[PDB]
Amino acid sequence: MTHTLPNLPYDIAALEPHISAKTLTFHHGKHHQAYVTNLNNLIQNTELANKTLEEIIHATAKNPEKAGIFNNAAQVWNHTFFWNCMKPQGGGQPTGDLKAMIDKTFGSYEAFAADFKQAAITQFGSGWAWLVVERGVLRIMKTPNADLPMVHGATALLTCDVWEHAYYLDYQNRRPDYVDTFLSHLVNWDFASALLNG
Amino acid sequence: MTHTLPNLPYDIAALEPHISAKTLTFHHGKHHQAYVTNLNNLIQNTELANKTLEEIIHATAKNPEKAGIFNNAAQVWNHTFFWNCMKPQGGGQPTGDLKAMIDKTFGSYEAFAADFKQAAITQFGSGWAWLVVERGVLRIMKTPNADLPMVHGATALLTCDVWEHAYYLDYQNRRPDYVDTFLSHLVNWDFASALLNG
Amino acid sequence: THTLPNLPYDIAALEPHISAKTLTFHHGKHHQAYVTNLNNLIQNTELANKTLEEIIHATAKNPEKAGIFNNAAQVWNHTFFWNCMKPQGGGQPTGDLKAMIDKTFGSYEAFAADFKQAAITQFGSGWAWLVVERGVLRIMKTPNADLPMVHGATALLTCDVWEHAYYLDYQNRRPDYVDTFLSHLVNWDFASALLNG
Amino acid sequence: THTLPNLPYDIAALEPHISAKTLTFHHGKHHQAYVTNLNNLIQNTELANKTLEEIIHATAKNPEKAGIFNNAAQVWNHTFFWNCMKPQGGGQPTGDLKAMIDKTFGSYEAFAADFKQAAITQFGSGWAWLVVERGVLRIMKTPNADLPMVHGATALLTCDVWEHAYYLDYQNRRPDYVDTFLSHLVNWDFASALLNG
Ligand SMILES: [Fe+3]
Ligand SMILES: [Fe+3]
Ligand SMILES: [Fe+3]
Ligand SMILES: [Fe+3]
């Protein structure tokens, strides 16, 4: 157990009712934990046992034979990132640098929000919707399964988990309502704005 | 419109307590319905409007720009196939032709069930676990997302939906328990046996 | 599907300013290769049914399709480039374009100084442009295959500053090449037509 | 402050694979220009007292001081490139480096194909590298002045694929140039020392 499950940055009930404590209990305590334990078991006694998580993600991103390692390693990263993407009483619009860059790039926050929700809702199957910056330009991305921006040469600013386990207890099939609530009440814009200046 | 949602072959509560009436209500009445409505809207005013569902699947399986149409068309097919793969008082073992072919190929039913379970459990993200016949040989197949045996040249005999919406309300993360319940109490072996002789 | 357009003049008609040897490789190899690359990348795709300009607009947003964008835009850029030049070019525009340059830069010499600055400060491969964007003349420079239309601007004039455009004749002396482009090759009638197009 | 280092051999020592004419322009004009540009850009700045490598790392975290990064990285890249070649080079590596290439790529030939592919699929100006990061070998391609050290990797070998590197001798035929680099010029002794550096 050289990799460990990080604490949630808030109480399991902090996102109620938008994301339920039951969801967070299974999502963090079961899914996120299993990705960690799988990763630990898959790299034991291998050359990857002495690498960081980010090093493992990049080292196994190409080799389809190592897809089991990439899939668990990237999911550990993605879920830690996702918990920090949210906060109780979040949502709204960002300010300052990120707000201005979004207006410069998309024309408005509403334009950004519509593009983000479309990527989130058109990602078929399991995956992730992202706001990224790449060579200094903001882009929306959607990725399948465990894929994530860093292996495409982009820096993630924000993500929304659209694996069905992230919303099914609370929203069932209503993924659009889930993403709309994410945008309206949960997104931590201070987080994305700090990462933009990183 | 062009394509219709077929009735379940049993009451929404007929698989209780193994699959809840709640799950079947969302799984059939929302997810399966949505794939039908999407398909109908996507092929309207196109050459695909005049073809059978199977023809649409093969016509869109090759070209990535038509993946939206493929994804919904194949999901209509997969779910319809899946409902018929189950029945109240299912489970047990197959008889006759299919039992003998499983014993010749896997050595035993228990070996087949171990291999079907592991494919279902190691399918990362959304997808399907299949028993197929291919080039005269019985094989286990796992497919991601909407993918399915026929566009690979195999004949499907049985499937288990391992999209998270298939089990999350009743089993949450415990996909192995759900698959174990599928084999133990739900699988309709009469269906797979007839298809083997189709 | 897509074809290389002929040069609008003799392969040797820009000598000594741009050599026939340069044009042979620039038109017959580089521009040809972008056309053949584009055809192979769009075959059996919905892009096969679109125009060059529609391909450029359909792929500018999706980095996954940068190979198609780069070949499509380079086809467009080079065709534009051949038509920006002519034997016995150079001099200055007259009429509408001259007056807009004089009102915007103050002077033709001011425009040529700014155009040449953008051309020589483009690091690596790219293009220097005179564009009109919401009714205003601007100098633009673009890296690699980038071009004005995906930035909401209308190209009036371009000079290729990929090294293959000048290395056989000028080697490292990109500033001399651009000065020779403005002095002897630019076709101001083309740019003036585009301003009213 | 910074100066242009000697070529490690006579300008004709790589004939007929790379012409003396190419080396005179590539080393005496391009490499020299990166050095003179760097000196002029850092004068009276905080960066004037730092080493080339210190300047590269400090400015790499930035798009706003990009003339300094681009010229400093190009100074570094070219010095490294000249030492990646030798007269009567080519062949294959032996010992430590050969073993790692076999374990990593399966064979030298797989390595050379992957290296070739990176060199030819780099669109525009750029570089193809063999790098090592955390004991793992891989191939890298970078655009313009970008280089492995700012990505956390150690360069072992590079091939310049800016068009000035080959256009006088190969024109558009980058694949043949890279083939010739691998076949006749690569200095494997250099890369094997760096693996253990
Ligand atoms: Fe998740
Ligand atoms: Fe389903
Ligand atoms: Fe060109
Ligand atoms: Fe160079």
Nearest chain C CA: its distance from A139 CA (Å): 9
Q: Please report residues of D whose CB lies closer than 8 A to that of C145.
A: 123-124
Nearest chain B CA: its distance from A178 CA (Å): 15
> What is the CA(D26)–ligand 4 centre distance, in A?
6
Chains B and D touch (3+ CB pairs under 8 A): no
Tokens of C74: 């380079």
User: What is the distance between the alpha carbons of residues B32 and B35, in angstroms, rounded to a whole number?
Assistant: 5
Within chain A, residue ranges assigned H as helices are 21-26, 33-43, 53-60, 67-85, 96-106, 109-122, 168-171, 175-181, 189-196
Q: What is the stated resolution of the deposited model, in angstroms?
A: 1.9
> What is the CA(B35)–ligand 2 centre distance, in A?
10
Residue of A nearest to C64 (CA): A152
Task: Give the three-class secondary structure for D88.
Answer: coil
Burial class (CB in 10 A: 0-12, 13-18, 19+), D191: buried
Q: Which ligand is nearest to the CA of D76?
A: 4
- B158 within 8 A of B187, measured Cβ to Cβ: yes
CA angle at B83 for the pair B80 and B86, rounded to the nearest 5°: 150
User: What is the distance between the alpha carbons of residues A124 and B71, in angstroms, rounded to a whole number?
Assistant: 8
CB count within 10 Å of CB C30 equals 19
Question: Which residues have CB atoms below 5 A from the ion given as ligand 1?
Answer: A 161, 163, 166
Q: Please report residues of B whose CB lies closer than 8 A to that of C45.
A: 63, 65
Residues 6+ apart with CB under 8 A from D62: D69
DSSP string, B45-99: TSGGGGS-HHHHHHHHSS-GGGHHHHHHHHHHHHHHHHHHTB-TT--S---HHHH
User: What is the distance between the alpha carbons of residues A144 and A162, in angstroms, rounded to a whole number?
Assistant: 9
CA angle at D13 for the pair D7 and D19, rounded to the nearest 5°: 95
User: What is the distance between the alpha carbons of residues B184 and C6, in angstroms, rounded to a whole number?
Assistant: 72
Chains D and C touch (3+ CB pairs under 8 A): yes
Percentages helix, strand, coil for chain D (3-state, rounded to 5) are 55, 15, 30
DSSP 8-class letter at D86: -
The CA-to-CA distance between both ends of chain A, in Å, stands at 30
Give the 3-state secondary structure of D50-65. Answer: CCHHHHHHHHHCCCCC
User: What is the distance between the alpha carbons of residues C155 and C100, in angstroms, rounded to a whole number?
Assistant: 15
- D75 within 8 A of D2, measured Cβ to Cβ: yes
> What is the CA(C130)–ligand 4 centre distance, in A?
29
Percentages helix, strand, coil for chain C (3-state, rounded to 5) are 55, 15, 30
Q: Which ligand is nearest to the CA of A75?
A: 1
Residues 6+ apart with CB under 8 A from C176: C170
Q: How many domains does chain A have?
A: 1
- D27 within 8 A of D7, measured Cβ to Cβ: yes
Asked whether the beta carbons of residue A59 and residue D135 sit closer than 8 angstroms, the reply is no
User: What is the distance between the alpha carbons of residues C108 and C88, in angstroms, rounded to a whole number?
Assistant: 19
User: What is the distance between the alpha carbons of residues A83 and A27, in angstroms, rounded to a whole number?
Assistant: 10
Amino acid identity at C18 = I
Burial class (CB in 10 A: 0-12, 13-18, 19+), A139: buried
Nearest chain A CA: its distance from D160 CA (Å): 22
Chains D and A touch (3+ CB pairs under 8 A): yes
- D101 within 8 A of D180, measured Cβ to Cβ: no
Asked whether the beta carbons of residue B145 and residue A125 sit closer than 8 angstroms, the reply is yes
Q: Which residues of B touch A (CB under 8 A)?
A: 26, 30-31, 34, 67-68, 71, 124-127, 144-146, 163-165, 168-169, 172-173
Task: Give the three-class secondary structure for D18.
Answer: coil
The CA-to-CA distance between both ends of chain D, in Å, stands at 27
Nearest chain D CA: its distance from C30 CA (Å): 7
Residue in A67, A144, A173 closest to B165 by CB: A173
Amino acid identity at C152 = G
- C129 within 8 A of C148, measured Cβ to Cβ: yes
CB count within 10 Å of CB C10 equals 11
Q: In Å, how far are A108, B149, D53, D63, D76 from D42, measured between CA atoms? A: 39, 64, 14, 16, 16
> What is the CA(A168)–ligand 1 centre distance, in A?
11
Q: How many CB pairs under 8 A join A and B?
A: 60
For residue A104, give its domain range: 1-198
Q: How many CA atoms lie within 13 A of B63 on its CB side?
A: 16
Give the 3-state secondary structure of B10-54. Answer: CCCCCCCCCCCHHHHHHHHHHHHHHHHHHHHHHHCCCHHHHCCHH
> What is the CA(C160)–ligand 3 centre distance, in A?
6
Residue whose entry in the numeric block shows the structure tokens 């300052």: A96
* Peptide bond between residue B17 and the one before it cis (omega within 30 degrees of 0): yes
What's the sign of the alpha-carbon dihedral D61, D65, D70, D71?
A: negative
Nearest chain A CA: its distance from D53 CA (Å): 22
DSSP string, A6-48: PPPSS-TTTTTTTS-HHHHHHIIIIIIHHHHHHHHHHHTTSGG
Amino acid identity at D84 = C
> What is the CA(B130)–ligand 2 centre distance, in A?
14
C-alpha A60: how far from its chain's center? 19
Q: Which residues of D touch C (CB under 8 A)?
A: 25, 29-30, 33, 66-67, 70, 123-126, 143-145, 162-164, 167-168, 171-172
- B175 within 8 A of A171, measured Cβ to Cβ: no
Chain B contact partners (≥3 CB pairs within 8 A) = A, C
